[PDB]
Design a protein around this ligand. Sequence first.
Ligand SMILES: *[C@@H]1O[C@H](CO)[C@@H](O[C@@H]2O[C@H](CO)[C@@H](O)[C@H](O)[C@H]2NC(C)=O)[C@H](O)[C@H]1NC(C)=O
Lengths: 49, 49
Amino acid sequence: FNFSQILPDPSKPSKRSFIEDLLFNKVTLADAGFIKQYGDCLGDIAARD
Amino acid sequence: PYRVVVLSFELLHAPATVCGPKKSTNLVKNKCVNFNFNGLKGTGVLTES
Ligand SMILES: *[C@@H]1O[C@H](CO)[C@@H](O[C@@H]2O[C@H](CO)[C@@H](O)[C@H](O)[C@H]2NC(C)=O)[C@H](O)[C@H]1NC(C)=O
């Protein structure tokens, strides 16, 4: 039996394995938003999200 | 001989004619301050963009 698809791989950021890593990029719509050190929009130099 | 001038101005304020803004102040930056740039009012910090 072959389980390398679901088993975690150390040679990768975190311990995310292939299947859930592929699933993770499927959402890519909320863009997290869990205050990733917000307040950086002190000067709205970008499109201010 | 005394020189005299008579001054008369109308009212009802619909044809706004003369008025006067004056009272222009200075500018500061990177500090919390109330702003009244052109009639709009608010509080915040002023920086570049
Ligand atoms: C289990 O499945 C994986 C699929 O990822 C196999 O990995 C492939 O192995 C071949 C030759 O070993 C490589 O040419 C492929 O590039 C590998 N896949 C990927 C995505 O890189 C693995 O070989 C399988 N297990 C066994 C025992 O065959």
